[PDB]
Design an enzyme around this catalytic site. Structure first.
Site, PDB file in Angstrom:
ATOM      1  N   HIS A 144       0.735  -1.154   0.029  1.00 43.80           N
ATOM      2  CA  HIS A 144       0.021   0.020   0.033  1.00 43.80           C
ATOM      3  C   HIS A 144       0.935   1.062   0.027  1.00 43.80           C
ATOM      4  CE1 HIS A 144      -3.322   2.621   0.596  1.00 43.80           C
ATOM      5  NE2 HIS A 144      -2.871   3.140   1.875  1.00 43.80           N
ATOM      6  N   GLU A 183       2.343   1.603  -3.939  1.00 46.86           N
ATOM      7  CA  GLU A 183       1.105   1.798  -4.389  1.00 46.86           C
ATOM      8  C   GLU A 183       0.958   3.615  -4.252  1.00 46.86           C
ATOM      9  OE1 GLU A 183      -2.342   2.854  -2.230  1.00 46.86           O
ATOM     10  OE2 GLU A 183      -1.833   3.345  -4.107  1.00 46.86           O
ATOM     11  N   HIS A 199     -28.532 -18.487  -2.855  1.00 43.13           N
ATOM     12  CA  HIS A 199     -29.802 -18.051  -3.448  1.00 43.13           C
ATOM     13  C   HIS A 199     -30.746 -19.172  -2.455  1.00 43.13           C
ATOM     14  CE1 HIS A 199     -33.377 -18.227  -5.842  1.00 43.13           C
ATOM     15  NE2 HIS A 199     -32.935 -17.346  -6.503  1.00 43.13           N
ATOM     16  N   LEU A 200     -30.298 -20.015  -1.907  1.00 41.69           N
ATOM     17  CA  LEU A 200     -31.466 -20.662  -1.195  1.00 41.69           C
ATOM     18  C   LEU A 200     -31.289 -20.375   0.512  1.00 41.69           C
ATOM     19  CD1 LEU A 200     -33.289 -22.958  -2.062  1.00 41.69           C
ATOM     20  CD2 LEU A 200     -31.523 -22.543  -3.856  1.00 41.69           C
ATOM     21  N   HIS A 243     -32.634 -15.761   1.287  1.00 44.45           N
ATOM     22  CA  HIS A 243     -33.916 -15.339   0.444  1.00 44.45           C
ATOM     23  C   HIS A 243     -35.110 -14.839   1.184  1.00 44.45           C
ATOM     24  CE1 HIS A 243     -36.291 -16.366  -3.301  1.00 44.45           C
ATOM     25  NE2 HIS A 243     -37.281 -16.587  -2.126  1.00 44.45           N
ATOM     26  N   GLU A 244     -35.684 -13.713   1.019  1.00 45.76           N
ATOM     27  CA  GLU A 244     -36.673 -13.499   1.750  1.00 45.76           C
ATOM     28  C   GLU A 244     -37.946 -13.791   0.788  1.00 45.76           C
ATOM     29  OE1 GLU A 244     -33.899 -10.031   2.109  1.00 45.76           O
ATOM     30  OE2 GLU A 244     -34.445 -10.966   0.446  1.00 45.76           O
ATOM     31  N   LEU A 303     -31.279 -10.276   7.038  1.00 48.97           N
ATOM     32  CA  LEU A 303     -30.081 -11.241   7.135  1.00 48.97           C
ATOM     33  C   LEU A 303     -29.277 -11.223   5.784  1.00 48.97           C
ATOM     34  CD1 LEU A 303     -30.275 -14.261   6.067  1.00 48.97           C
ATOM     35  CD2 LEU A 303     -31.958 -14.395   7.708  1.00 48.97           C
TER      36      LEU A 303
END
Lengths: 9, 5, 948, 940
Positions: free
Chosen positions: C62, C65, C290-291, C294-295, C313
């Site tokens: 850092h 750079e 995805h499972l 998922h709301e 969540l």
């Protein structure tokens, strides 16, 4: 990108 | 709410 | 000249011709041609992170750079890169990750050579000096010093810390001037030799990749990049990686307890998993993401809502470094959610086991793959800076053909890897972490790097063998068939009355519209926005406080419904504003009516679930009083706005008047807000005009039908005004930031109203001092890391401001700002003609610039329609005035407005000071503001801008 | 004829004016008033000569004589010499004519006692009756009757005098028209002058004079000044006029009349003839019945008549008549359907009378009325120096020399038997009814003799009679509850260490603000308290402003029936509204204002609504709103100009439509929201202490929090509206067309500046130097119109100069001639000498400097300044001290830049109102869009 940058964006 | 999205 | 690609996969929507290749030294190079681009750009990505620092000196990559921007041997000037890029409407920026480091810029129409050669010399040979290493560690100190109280970082470094302390994961990325400068000279270790060894050892190898977004051709510039990056020579450095995951079994099955500074409450559930970046075709981690996260009806979140423990969540898998991966379930908690954590994580393994009994699903994979294919096929246009950094940032992993189709196209559904990752989620693999401010006096251990406090409550086996013992179900279920998937992808043709700017079509005392068929983009998607008005929304703190509570509970009770729309590509957003409330629904063209309609009928005919109201009330009362734990310069930009307007109430007013809002009070308030009101809206994109009138018709007819809405009188369609400072004044007032050890300041020079001849004076003067302000106030004088100076525009009235925060006392800063003013005007009168026309051309290219995405012009139209100016062509005529300006004109703008002896001088200053707190000119006496309302009682108010 | 009998007279010790009653041997009652502190002196003579004793053929002879007695004496036989002596020295004489009195009175500048008395005593020696007096005063009688043509009083009085016995002298005519004075006598050849000297010589000189002199000379100068020049009066022993019979002798009892009025009014008139109770002034049962009928309290008569919605208001009581008889009258207002239930109404009146016939006479009522009129006599306020003498000379004939001041203001004994007697007089055999209503057209043939109104006999049938007597019962009528608040604490409180001459801020919180001032200058047993209740929700929307209005209106309508009995004790109040909040005024004595103010706060906190009452008030304000199409176009101009110059202004059009939407549940929601959270401000002034002032205010804010949980306001929302700023050159205009009035108003505003101390006197002095010459030239010379006004404007902290002119012209013609008038004063400035200048600043000086004349006056000035947030208590003295140090060139330099036509700081804007037959201003919102707003004034 919690990544530090050369200039604030 | 997937972490990636 | 080793490897050339023949043709790669592009969406049939793009027009940008591509080419991939590989050079003699093994650099993966991608070339993009564009005949109709206007700002060319380029980037590079060295595959070296901060996980290759030497053990003695911490945070070299850092610092490297950060030091590379200053100084080369073929350009010994300190700023010739930054100065040349800012003379040409460009901007350069860079950052370091834990694994790699991105360098990227953008530049004007054709100035590729004079800036690409400056970006190339960047790596051929850099030269440092005493000066730079001597005044740069102060900026890295400000970097760490803004994050020692920054709540997004303490958990990051504390997860980095409590792992394997002999592991390279347990490393510090920033450096705080103590390990960087003070420690190595405490024991006499040099720093410059370490920097030249670091660079010659790591950076010069094959590892880095480049990309360039060119205008000329795809053969004019391939021979350009073969002669310009050919010097960096392959040192055959293999990629650093490490198969040992940092979580060894001694520090598994553990539950920490962290104490924050700002009042939040969260629960992190961490699982370790092996690397699955090698599996980029089946993508099992996205399936379980995805499972899990998922709301909707009968899913993990909705049940925790139903027991009143959890607000929201986030599921999915975190990716760390290379050769190892994480998997996180991060939750926030309610007041009595922190009492039942073992039951929350019990329900989490209940839903996991409910997904392990049935396992893989074919139609979920087919659905998700269809959704990514349609979302890829109408992929919108890209801004050329940031895009080339992205596709250089993933160029290390994938071959040349699918550089673009990354995580968009999926070939196979392999249930074996789904089952594999779903087996590694077991309560022998847990690492629980609790964040709560109730542990103030209970913590033994403290962090050395950041100074945070936490515990070790290793979970005894009672609750482990209570977690995996007997897990049938709660009331969970799998998500159902999606109905918001799109089917209409037809571009409607252009009608007879085709206008270049949105036209007023309806004008009644109830509503108005602004409509334009899309002419440029041809994507089967449109954006609809609305602004409802009410004079009762900001009358007093109580009525300015019920608005957020009502709107919030509306979002609470409607996310359960509309998460499938946000998942299919239809996003809405409904938040409050000062004048009234607001609405904006954007996305694919097919299912806007259904969604918008349902939003209205849930908006007007609205009941209150009492426990939900009582949760949101406390979650807002704990969101007001933790404004005191936040950055100093943000408190400056908060205080200045409150003082410079007609009426506004502080965060100290609104949290006192939350001790009165109750359910019956709020319940009669909603018919008071929606009783008489007025709507203003634009419709934009791919829609016919009859359907536009149908949309506004169904909207105002639903509000008629359910709310009994009447139109407002035109004399109570009003805006707020801005205080007028005296012709000669020096206003300042100080407040004290409670938790940050830095000070901060914002000083405000107010000129005048929005004219077409006076916005270009301030715009050009804010462009002539944009680089020298950075250059002499952050680089040369090293006043801190947050330096910004530009135009501030509120209520039409324009002013030039300065935001700056530092360790130094603030009046010192305001004096050296005045020194910068004097040096600036002295540099203006000395400068030549050609550089002056170059600055005018840089502003005429920066401002005369077409937007690429459809939302980037809907936010250009709406942002002025909500300001009641309705001036759509201020980008052409205004910049046509910008070309005819003289050198003396800026001095005539400068002298009576911004100078110290000026007759017309308006200046107000906000000082935020800390917890325990080159020629300077002569300052007149200030006058202090000890009361905001007695201040705003004795000053006139500006007139509002007349419409076009 | 110098005969003297008198002694010390009891006068209530507040008064310092020295008095003396006596009687001269030629039968002349003489009072002597000596106040060396009165500005204007006066004198009066009352002749108790009956108009009943007049020739039947010639009517109104004593009236025509009191016109003719004015001109001509023997010491000064010139024509106007009395009139010229009163035209030089500001005097004005005037006498009237009643059944038994003619009462001359006059005044004089300072000292002209000798002068006017030389022109006034020798009326009795030598009346002249020359050519010119005769020929002008007969026209004066004809014009007096001509102006009493449309005068409804004389007409109804004559209709009461004449429809009895046509032989009884009660049916004579008081004024006398032109037909009896010079039409029948000259055609019969009878000389009027010979008859006049008979009446004047025989009748006047005999006795019963009531001379009185408001003088400032001494106890003796005026004594031998009037007793010397009144010896030419010579006794004749004329008999006193009296009646042993009533003029209503059973021919016209139990009878109706139907009266046609010109003006659209409706009234009901019940009359009872009753015997003489003038000798019984100790108990005065006729005023006791007038007290008990027109009471408005729990269970009162008007309470039930209101609860049935037929009757607006009433008045009743003993009405004096001739020496012999008296009347007892009840005069009631009518609604539409009140005209249909007349007998029901009257039945309820009888029921009430019967409730008094049941419980008989009352004693504690008599003691209470005795103490309240004793106190009301003790603490009288003042008397006009003219008219007083004519009043006490009016009752000097009827009362001994000790009773001329304690006239009816003290009661000795209780006479319950007389009250049974007059209760026996109040029966339906005795009633005489008359009804006024416009709807009585074509139905009344029997014409009045003098005026010519028409009525009908229409005897009441007997079934209505018999239902009244035998059927008599009680409903909701109960004796009035005693309103006893113990008014005995009249002590004065001495001034303490806090000897400030200006109100000090004794309390400041974030809740309230309290200013205090004990009375130094007046020392009265009185106190005044003023309260403002500031709240944001008042003027937010046309609906909220209408709801605030209706709130205070129904609060007053609820509280009036309870409050009126306390107002009868000498404690008056007012509830009104502000554009900002609510206004409460409480003025009266110090003894019991705390309990009244306490109950007012308890009342408007816990407040209820009746439905049809709410509907009537609603319709009523809807009418008061759409009336504004029908008002004066100068008011239209002042209404439109203020709406244009302020920040927010709700027009009456918006208020008209919004009023319809208001409902009862909606108002019942509005009331506690408004009262929820507010700020208080109060000015306490009178004979009080600081600790008791703190305790009463404490009481007030404690009652507000106890009832509706009042919370303080936030100090960022105590904002005050600003005023539109003119762009330094602008002359803006627009027009509004009236529909009804065929008149064109115009108002021409000029904005100077905020009120600094210099700018008040620049603008005031320039306004007054253009004041009197505008009165000279505008109405008289240019003949612009009749309603023409000019001068300053003090509003929202901004000064201004205005010219309101309504006339029937094109309005731009009128503006052009206003500017010509402005040029006339602009050149008339520079030709001003020093004397005009100095008289002008001294005129302004004495105009501004003046001590108060009542505690309410100075308190109104201090309150009128606290509501403006200036707090400059001695701006008068400071501004005057600045005022004498100004020059002519100072107002030249004030004039040009702000007011001239070639002016750099000229801020001008006019409003044109047209009749029924720059840039324009289409939308006033788009007007107010781009103009800045002024700062406010730093409070001192």
């Amino acid at each position: 990108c919690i990544c530090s940058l050369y200039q604030l964006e | 709410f997937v972490n990636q999205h | 000249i080793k490897r050339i690609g023949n043709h790669i996969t592009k969406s049939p929507e793009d027009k940008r011709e591509y080419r991939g290749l590989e050079l003699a030294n093994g650099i993966k190079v991608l070339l993009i041609s564009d005949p109709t681009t206007d700002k060319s750009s380029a980037a590079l990505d060295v595959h070296i992170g901060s996980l290759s620092d030497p053990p003695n000196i911490a945070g070299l990559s850092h610092f490297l750079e950060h030091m590379l921007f200053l100084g080369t041997k073929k350009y010994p000037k300190e700023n010739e890169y930054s100065q040349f890029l800012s003379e040409h409407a460009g901007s350069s920026n860079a950052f370091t990750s834990g694994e790699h480091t991105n360098y990227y810029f953008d530049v004007s129409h054709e100035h590729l050579e004079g800036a690409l050669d400056r970006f190339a010399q960047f790596f051929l040979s850099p030269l440092f000096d005493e000066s730079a290493k001597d005044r740069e560690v102060n900026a890295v100190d400000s970097e760490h010093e803004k994050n020692v109280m920054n709540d997004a970082w303490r958990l990051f470094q504390l997860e980095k810390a409590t792992g394997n302390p002999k592991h390279p994961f347990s490393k510090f990325g920033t450096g705080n001037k103590y390990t960087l400068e003070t420690r190595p000279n405490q024991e006499g270790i040099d720093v410059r030799q370490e920097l030249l060894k670091f660079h010659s050892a790591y950076y010069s190898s094959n590892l880095m990749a480049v990309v360039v977004l060119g205008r000329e051709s795809l053969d004019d510039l391939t021979n350009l990049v073969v002669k310009l990056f050919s010097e960096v020579e392959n040192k055959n450095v293999p990629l650093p990686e490490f198969p040992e995951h940092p979580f060894q079994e001694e520090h598994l099955k553990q539950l920490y307890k962290i104490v924050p500074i700002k009042d939040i409450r969260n629960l992190y559930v961490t699982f370790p998993i092996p690397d699955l970046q090698k599996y980029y075709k089946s993508n099992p981690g996205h399936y379980l993401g995805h499972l899990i996260g998922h709301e909707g009806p009968g899913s993990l979140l909705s049940e925790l809502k139903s027991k009143g423990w959890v607000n929201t969540l986030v599921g999915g898998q975190k990716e760390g470094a290379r050769g190892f991966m994480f998997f996180i379930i991060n939750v926030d908690l309610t007041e009595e959610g922190l009492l039942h954590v073992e039951d929350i994580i019990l329900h989490m393994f209940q839903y996991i086991q409910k997904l392990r009994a049935e396992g893989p699903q074919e139609w979920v994979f087919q659905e998700l793959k269809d959704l990514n294919a349609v979302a890829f096929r109408f992929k919108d246009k890209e801004r050329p800076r940031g895009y080339t950094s992205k596709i250089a940032g993933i160029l290390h992993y994938y071959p040349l053909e699918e550089v673009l189709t990354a995580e968009y196209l999926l070939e196979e559904f392999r249930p074996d890897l789904i089952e594999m990752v779903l087996d590694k989620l077991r309560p022998e693999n847990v690492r629980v972490a609790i964040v709560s401010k109730s542990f103030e006096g209970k913590t033994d251990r403290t962090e050395e790097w950041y100074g945070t406090q936490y515990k070790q409550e290793a979970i005894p086996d009672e609750v482990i063998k209570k977690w995996q013992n007997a897990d049938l179900n709660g009331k969970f279920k799998l998500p159902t068939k999606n109905e918001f998937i799109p089917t209409n992808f037809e571009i409607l043709p252009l009608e007879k009355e085709a206008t270049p700017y949105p036209a007023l079509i309806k004008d009644t005392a109830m509503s108005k519209l602004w409509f334009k068929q899309d002419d440029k983009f041809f994507l089967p998607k449109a954006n609809l926005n609305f602004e409802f008005f009410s004079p009762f929304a900001y009358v007093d703190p109580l009525h300015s406080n019920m608005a957020y509570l009502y709107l919030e509970l509306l979002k609470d009770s409607l996310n359960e419904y509309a998460y499938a729309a946000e998942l299919a590509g239809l996003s809405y957003d409904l938040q409050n504003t000062i004048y009234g409330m607001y609405l904006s629904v954007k996305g694919y063209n097919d299912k806007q009516p259904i969604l918008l309609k349902k939003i209205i009928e849930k908006m007007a005919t609205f009941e209150i679930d009492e426990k939900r109201f009582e949760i949101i009330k406390e979650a807002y009362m704990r969101s007001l009083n933790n404004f005191r734990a936040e950055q100093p310069h943000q408190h400056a930009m908060y205080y200045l706005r409150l003082l410079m307007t007609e009426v506004a109430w502080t965060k100290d007013e609104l949290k006192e008047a939350l001790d009165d809002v109750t359910l019956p009070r709020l319940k009669a308030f909603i018919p008071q807000l929606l009783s008489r009101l007025h709507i203003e809206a634009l419709l934009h994109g791919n829609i016919t005009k009859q359907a536009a009138l149908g949309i506004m018709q169904m909207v105002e007819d639903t509000l008629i039908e359910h709310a009994h809405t009447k139109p407002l009188l035109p004399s109570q369609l009003v805006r707020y005004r801005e205080v007028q400072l005296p012709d000669r004044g020096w206003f300042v007032y100080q407040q004290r930031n409670e938790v940050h050890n830095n000070s901060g300041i914002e000083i405000y020079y107010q000129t005048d109203m929005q004219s077409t001849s006076e916005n270009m004076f301030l715009e050009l003067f804010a462009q002539i001092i944009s680089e020298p302000a950075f250059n002499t106030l952050r680089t040369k004088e090293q006043l801190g890391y947050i330096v910004f100076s530009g135009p501030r525009r509120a209520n039409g009235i324009q002013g030039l401001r300065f935001i700056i925060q530092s360790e130094k006392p603030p009046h010192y800063l305001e004096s050296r700002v005045e020194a910068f003013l004097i040096t600036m005007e002295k540099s203006i009168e000395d400068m030549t003609e050609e550089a002056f026309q170059k600055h005018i051309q840089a502003l005429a290219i920066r401002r005369l610039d077409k937007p690429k995405k459809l939302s980037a012009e809907s936010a250009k139209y709406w942002g002025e329609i909500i300001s009641q100016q309705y001036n759509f062509d201020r980008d052409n005529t205004e910049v046509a005035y910008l070309k005819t300006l003289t050198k003396e004109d800026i001095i005539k703008f400068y002298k009576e407005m911004l100078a110290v002896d000026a007759p017309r001088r308006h200046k107000v200053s906000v000082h935020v000071l800390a917890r325990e707190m080159s020629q300077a000119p002569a300052l007149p006496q200030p006058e202090v503001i000890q009361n905001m309302t007695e201040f705003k009682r004795g000053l006139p108010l500006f007139p509002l801008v007349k419409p076009h």
